[PDB]
Write a protein that binds this DNA or RNA. Structure first.
Ligand SMILES: [Ca+2]
Ligand SMILES: [Zn+2]
Ligand SMILES: [Zn+2]
Length: 54
DNA sequence: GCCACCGGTGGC
DNA sequence: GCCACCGGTGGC
């Protein structure tokens, strides 16, 4: 429960990255160049994340 | 004013 | 020293 996490929504309760969204595809562990550096789209808090991350 | 980056660090 | 993931912003 931080500035960007309500700790209660479905996104906040996911711990696993989907591996198929733009943010995951950017990640090194999914073969990306690690230039965007955000959490999986599915883990973006529904209440508190920047709107364009949702 | 928005958002794709990019710089930075809390918490290991 | 690393890595997840945040906040600031150049360029639009
Ligand atoms: Ca540190
Ligand atoms: Zn994802
Ligand atoms: Zn949430």
């Amino acid at each position: 429960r931080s500035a960007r996490m309500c700790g209660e929504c479905e996104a906040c309760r996911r711990t696993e990255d989907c591996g198929h969204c733009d943010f995951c595809r950017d990640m090194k562990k999914f073969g990306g160049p690690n230039k965007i550096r955000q959490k999986c789209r599915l883990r973006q808090c529904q209440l508190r994340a920047r709107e364009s991350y949702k």
